[PDB]
């Protein structure tokens, strides 16, 4: 059980999927969406071509 669940939804390009993870850098990580280094939770990504 958990006290807070926050589903954050968005769209990126495949090469940038790696950037959605704690401790990552790059365009998306630096300027669009930044996770904490101690992030606790799951990341899910699927092609939507």
């Amino acid at each position: 059980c958990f006290t807070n669940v926050y589903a954050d939804s968005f769209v990126i390009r495949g090469d940038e999927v790696r950037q959605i993870a704690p401790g990552q850098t790059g365009k998306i990580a630096d300027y669009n969406y930044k996770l904490p280094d101690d992030f606790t939770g799951c990341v899910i990504a699927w092609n939507s071509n």
């Binding site: 704690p22 401790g23 850098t25 280094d37």
Partner: protein
């Protein structure tokens, strides 16, 4: 050098490196403190004599 590790590596791996450094320095300090305790017991025996 702690500063070089902080300035050079990203936080995810700099954290592990500083963990290593902290463990090492703590072990060195513990060894020094134990040696000081034993030598001080010797000196206390000498002072009692």
């Amino acid at each position: 050098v702690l500063n070089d590790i902080l300035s050079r590596l990203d936080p995810p791996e700099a954290e592990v490196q500083i963990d290593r450094l902290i463990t090492g320095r703590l072990q060195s300090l513990q060894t020094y403190v134990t040696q000081q305790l034993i030598r001080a017991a010797e000196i206390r025996a000498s002072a009692n004599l």
